Amino acid sequence: MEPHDTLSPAQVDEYRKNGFLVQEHVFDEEEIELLRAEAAQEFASGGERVTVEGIVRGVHGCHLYSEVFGRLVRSPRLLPIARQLLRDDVYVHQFKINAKRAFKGEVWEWHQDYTFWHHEDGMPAPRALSAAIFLDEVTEFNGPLTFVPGGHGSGMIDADVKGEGWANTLTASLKYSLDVETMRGLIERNGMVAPKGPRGSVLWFDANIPHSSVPNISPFDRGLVLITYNSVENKTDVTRGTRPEWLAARDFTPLTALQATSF
């Protein structure tokens, strides 16, 4: 293992100011292909953990079931940056894989992840973030995650609620959405940015940053592996929890990094 990676002070400042940051080329092509193959296995075998638009859209919880993905979350490319940004030991709250195949895709309601994790899972504060690993180059045209830079600084934003239980936390129509109303001011104030990057990049983003994405009109897929790390001190209150382990983790053991072994 290479000496644990960390973000420069400029990178940190950029992440805190904007609410997101791209590191290019974290993983190589061969690494990405391993992850892609495992994702395909999880989409085939994940059963109730899968979501379909038909056509698989998402699979959840894979680090609990896949040895590859259980290792990935402890990678020296990821874990030390999460600990650096959250200023704590960390654990995985949620793991999901979101594909947008060429010429497919949904419009995804503008939203803040933390609203779901607070209300559905009992997350007490937004001291969490996600790492989105680019299984394919992310361009203007294959439905990139789209943010309001600085939009997290509001904290959590009162939001239109739709549905019962949690079924529609993972779908087209999201349970907690930001209406056109609130969005206009956000965007007049702050603008919109769809970070781009090559295959193998990682996109870090704040649990409270507003985000959205459109359809992929490209002939190329947009597969993302999203790992949500949470602060151990910020562990969710499992007595207010309403979802299964494969959406909202309950094992709060602090993660340690993978070490090099001969196998």
Ligand X SMILES: O=C(O)[C@@H]1C[C@@H](O)CN1
Binders of a copy of itself among residues 95 to 124 (CB under 8 A) are 102-103, 107, 110
In the DSSP assignment, the letter for residue 11 is: H
Q: Give the residue, chosen from 68, 170, 257, 258, that forms a contact with ligand X under the rule CB under 6 A.
A: 170
Residue 85 or 224 with smaller CB distance to ligand X: 224
The entry of ligand X, a copy of itself, none that residue 103 binds, CB within 5 to 8 Å by partner kind: a copy of itself
Q: Is 98 annotated as a binding residue?
A: yes
Binders of ligand X among residues 94 to 133 (CB under 6 A) are 94, 113, 116-117
Q: Does 184 bind a copy of itself (CB under 8 A)?
A: yes
- The number of beta carbons lying within 10 Å of the beta carbon of residue 24 is 12
- What is the smallest separation between the CB atom of 258 and a copy of itself, expressed in angstroms? 37
Q: Does 140 bind a copy of itself (CB under 8 A)?
A: yes
In the DSSP assignment, the letter for residue 229 is: E
3-state secondary structure of 101: coil
CA dihedral (138, 196, 173, 48) positive or negative: positive
- Tell me what percent of the chain is helix, strand and coil, each rounded to the nearest 5: 30, 20, 50
Binders of ligand X among residues 77 to 96 (CB under 6 A) are 94
At 182, phi and psi to the nearest 5?
-50, -40
Which tokens is 54 given?
A: 């038909």
Tell me the residue length of the chain.
263
Nearest CA-CA partner of 50 in 62, 38, 68: 62
Stretch that binds a copy of itself, among 2-10, 16-24, 82-90, 186-194 (CB under 8 A): 186-194
CA 72, CA 98: separation in Å to the nearest integer? Answer: 16
Q: Is 113 annotated as a binding residue?
A: yes
Q: Is 87 annotated as a binding residue?
A: no
Residue 113 or 206 with smaller CB distance to ligand X: 113
The entry of ligand X, a copy of itself, none that residue 246 binds, CB within 5 to 8 Å by partner kind: none
- What is the smallest separation between the CB atom of 245 and a copy of itself, expressed in angstroms? 33
Q: Does 50 bind ligand X (CB under 6 A)?
A: no
CA 238, CA 194: separation in Å to the nearest integer? Answer: 34
Yes or no: say if 125 and 210 are a contact pair by the CB < 8 Å rule.
no
Q: Which residues bind a copy of itself (CB under 8 A)?
A: 102-103, 107, 110, 139-141, 146, 180, 183-184, 187-188, 192, 194, 212-215, 217-220
Q: Binding site for Fe(3+), residues?
A: 111, 113, 211
